[model samples]
Target chain A: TTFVALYDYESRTETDLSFKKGERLQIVNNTEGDWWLAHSLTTGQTGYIPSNYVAPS
Target chain B: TTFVALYDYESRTETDLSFKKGERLQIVNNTEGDWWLAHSLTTGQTGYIPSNYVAPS
Candidate 1:
């Protein structure tokens, strides 16, 4: 699934994904609590993202 | 690090961790965005949890 970022996020760690507010991310998996494993479409980075910071695109 | 849950959260899926308010959790990791990988002291279960739902104990 794809989701659009609702807020700009800067990665706090190597395992966190960063994105701009309007960028889209590939939601690789969302079955684990409020964090969704995502792949960045713009940077090609893969990491965890806050589900609340994104909405289905 | 350890953290205490500030809100009761029911797991939305099998991979999601469930916890009750005031419960103490062993924060295994917090490097992944807004979610922390945690181990429940009461349930002896480990999974990801929303960082905003917990406070440092």
Candidate 2:
């Protein structure tokens, strides 16, 4: 019924990447700003997006 | 080096929500598909997005 989400830095320009209707995102940043990047726990890909994109659970 | 993530329901349609770096998300849903919506554990927000948007670590 709930899940965590994060911004994708890899596809920064797209700005409209939809998932499979039930997919979730992993929070990669632990600090603030671009200093840290969010990553996909499954894909293992690194993203460089804003921090507001994610929240704690 | 891994964390969970969720989706934001309030700010829907934006398709461009940015967060600070070093932020971590929590996995709310254990199942798959739209049956499980992502939520912000910190902000207590609910979101209705795709499933593929998240991955396991």
Candidate 3:
């Protein structure tokens, strides 16, 4: 599934998740948290981007 | 599905994972990264903590 990024963010660590506005990310792990874990929809990088930073798909 | 910790980490986000040194965490998602996805062995709280924080168990 594709989740749309609602805001822009930069990552700092493996746990850090980053995305640009309107970017699409594929769901890998949807476990609840201050953020959600997923992979880049384009690059397949694993990280946790902000949960509210993207539009739920 | 138990993973042992090598170092201590603190959780700051929903994706943020934390555990005490030598603590055991239940296996959930083990995607490769500087960090990994897991739940507290005792609390069952799901989140992403650093992979280096724990040893492969």
Alpha-carbon runs more than 4 Å astray in model 3: A30-57, B1-17, B20-57
Tens digits of per-residue lDDT, candidate 1, B4-40, equal: 4455556554433555555444423444345645444
- TM value for model 2: 0.22
Encode model 3's per-residue lDDT on B1-57: one tens digit a residue.
333445554566555444445544433354433443444443333434433334433
TM-score of candidate 3 relative to the true fold: 0.29
DockQ of every candidate: 0.04, 0.08, 0.04
Error of 2 at B22 (Å): 16
TM-score of chain B of each: 0.49, 0.28, 0.41
The CAPRI-style docking tier of model 3 reads incorrect
Residue B42 Cα positional deviation in candidate 3, in Å, after optimal superposition: 38
Q: Candidate 2 - CAPRI tier?
A: incorrect
The CAPRI-style docking tier of model 1 reads incorrect
Model 1 chain A scores worst on lDDT over the 10 consecutive residues at A24-33
Candidate 3 residue pairs in backbone clash: A33-B14, A34-B14
